[PDB]
Amino acid sequence: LMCWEHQVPLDLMAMNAQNEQVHVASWPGYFDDEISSRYYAIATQTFVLMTSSIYTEEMKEMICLTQEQRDYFETFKSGHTCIYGPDGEPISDMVPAETEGIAYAEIDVERVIDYKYYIDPAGHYSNQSLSMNFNQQPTPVVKHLNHQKNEVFTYEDIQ
Amino acid sequence: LMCWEHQVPLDLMAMNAQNEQVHVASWPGYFDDEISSRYYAIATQTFVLMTSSIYTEEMKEMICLTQEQRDYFETFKSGHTCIYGPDGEPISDMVPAETEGIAYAEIDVERVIDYKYYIDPAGHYSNQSLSMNFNQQPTPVVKHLNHQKNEVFTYEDIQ
Numbered sequence A, B: 001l002m003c004w005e006h007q008v009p010l011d012l013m014a015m016n017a018q019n020e021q022v023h024v025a026s027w028p029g030y031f032d033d034e035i036s037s038r039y040y041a042i043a044t045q046t047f048v049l050m051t052s053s054i055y056t057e058e059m060k061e062m063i064c065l066t067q068e069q070r071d072y073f074e075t076f077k078s079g080h081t082c083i084y085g086p087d088g089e090p091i092s093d094m095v096p097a098e099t100e101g102i103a104y105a106e107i108d109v110e111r112v113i114d115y116k117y118y119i120d121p122a123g124h125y126s127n128q129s130l131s132m133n134f135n136q137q138p139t140p141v142v143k144h145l146n147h148q149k150n151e152v153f154t155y156e157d158i159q
Helices: A001-009 A009-017 A034-044 A058-063 A068-076 A107-117 B003-007 B009-017 B034-044 B057-063 B066-072 B109-116
Strands: A022-026 A047-051 A083-084 B022-026 B047-053 B082-084
Touching: A001 A034, A001 A083, A001 B003, A009 A034, A022 B082, A034 A047, A047 A107, A058 A068, A058 B009, A068 B109, A083 B082, B003 B009, B003 B034, B022 B034, B034 B047, B047 B109
Parallel strands: A022 A047, B022 B047
Antiparallel strands: A047 A083, B047 B082
């Protein structure tokens, strides 16, 4: 899931109904990410890879065309990259802020069994009065029926 | 053989060298058919079917323009249609003069043996001092070699 999808409960239920076990939480780097990813870990019983970006001088000098714009953009806060376990606790060192790096962890998918034990909202930890509709039908604006490939009459055939 | 081909000895020898047995002697109607055909029967030891045509008034009206031409063409003598044995003697009735008819005979190819006994110029009845050259190769003015059909480009193909 991407950024603020972690603060949309129906997205969490859509992932939980499909029995997710390892989850990638990609964030851009300006919106708060620690709490949302940790809660997703706890409430979905998943290992969470929280990945975030950093800012570069080339970016700042490409988009900040005015001193006011530059000063406003320089106040943007930094994201973090870390890996959490099914209990929301980190299982790796946080990459130093505003630096390039990769976080590593050992993922034992068997650990999720110890947390399905006492919570699984899409399974046993549910009430009959609250349910969710998950419509997976393709929803393009225009539906192509019997797609074809156009015939071409090459110049040589015509002459 | 046709008409005066029976009076050319080399044609008799060409037929004999191929061991002819039953001979069709075609004649037009004006030239003496009797002697040549009977001699052919004897000399080639063959049964000879002598066939001749007759004149009609439609032919005379077509080709005679003057009266002198008609009178001159009225003197042409008739042919004869008869069959002979390998001894030159008739084996069927001569058809009536200047009438349409068919002569029938019983041909016994076995009868030619008894006259091959007497004479066979292409075989035993020959002398080493005389010989014939029978050139059986084709003699066309233009020899067509590798006659092959060329392709044709149709209108639709060009279009």
